[PDB]
Design a protein around this ligand. Structure first.
Ligand code: NA
Ligand code: NA
Ligand code: NA
Ligand code: NA
Lengths: 211, 211
């Protein structure tokens, strides 16, 4: 959840908002180790429920998200249903556990390609065109993350937009991402420069991957 | 319907058969002028019912077809349901009126392209990949006709097969077609040659389009 003024500005300037719970357990092995554990349901529940209680009156918020990169655990299904029950006005989405689980109203993959399948075990990223028509599948597809804009990037961006326009159920996506997470450091003369991972003696680090 | 021995040979050698009623009204304007007319329902009914009565015991017949290029009329819907009622063991298909009408269990277009849409009014031929995932669509797609093999042709054949293998619900198609409809004629020296439309003083004719 963002600083509260963000939603005010989105209401007034006009931007659709996905409001997302502060839950990410990416570094767990497997990713859902905590989110499938009932011991962690109370902590997770508050991050979902208290977001809804705060932001439910903002017209800019159109979709609730259960968090990010926390696998798919039973705690997600419980909290999916909680939101559906208290606020039927907004779809609920969540990418973890393969982007098309029982905890999401929207097929919301990250970095699924337009034409190319990436058939990873358990959590495949199908071609978005292919994903829509998998047997029994009927949901809209909106990428929660796509076109990773790291350094000299956005090659193939047009391929996404051609597909979005041709396919009714491909309803777009959210580019990753808006702004480089670089930080200002200063040389001996006080001149500023842009710093990334490892520049603060921080270790281990992931270097330029924050930009 | 074919010569009775055909089905016997398909049973024994092993080929899947689409058994198709002897109904084509292509030259009508619009194409469904007779098939939407209840005065023509008796004649149509016999071409469907007497086919089913004859061929229903052949294992090679896996799909019934209501005919070809007769638009989509109320007579098709009636006869679709008749077959569904008398023989639940086989899907019923029919391409007329846009290939995805209420008279077909299978999306069965003719010459719909792999990636390219052809948005004709009333009867569009969508890209086959796109067709599968149109809102509310769930049926399998098998082209009743594709890859028109007229003369020096079958350019782009590989493109269909790549799509068929990638997409579960793209389950193939039937090439148009097996054998040139050329006829032997004899020259002044009694030497045989292959003839097509117009070579018998037949007019109007459609020349080489029979091959
Ligand atoms: Na679209
Ligand atoms: Na990053
Ligand atoms: Na297939
Ligand atoms: Na022909």
């Amino acid at each position: 959840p963002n600083h509260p003024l963000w939603y005010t500005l989105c209401d007034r300037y006009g931007l659709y908002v996905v409001d997302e719970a502060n839950i990410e357990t990416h570094g767990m092995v497997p990713m859902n180790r905590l989110t499938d554990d009932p011991r962690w349901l109370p902590a997770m529940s508050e991050r979902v429920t208290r977001m809804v209680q705060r932001d439910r009156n903002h017209p800019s918020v159109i979709i609730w998200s259960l968090g990010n990169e926390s696998g798919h655990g039973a705690n997600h299904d419980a909290l999916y249903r909680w939101i559906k029950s208290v606020d039927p006005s907004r779809p609920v989405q969540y990418e973890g556990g393969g982007a098309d689980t029982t905890a999401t109203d929207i097929i919301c993959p990250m970095y699924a390609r337009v034409d190319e399948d990436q058939p990873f075990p358990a959590v495949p990223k199908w071609s978005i065109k292919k994903w829509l028509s998998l047997p029994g599948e009927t949901r809209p597809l909106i990428l929660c993350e796509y076109a990773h804009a790291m350094g000299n990037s956005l090659g193939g961006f047009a391929k996404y937009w051609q597909a979005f326009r041709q396919y009714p159920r491909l309803q777009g996506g959210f580019v990753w991402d808006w702004v480089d997470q670089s930080l200002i450091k200063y040389d001996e003369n006080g001149n500023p420069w842009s710093a990334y991972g490892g520049d603060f003696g921080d270790t281990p680090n992931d270097r330029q991957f924050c930009m």
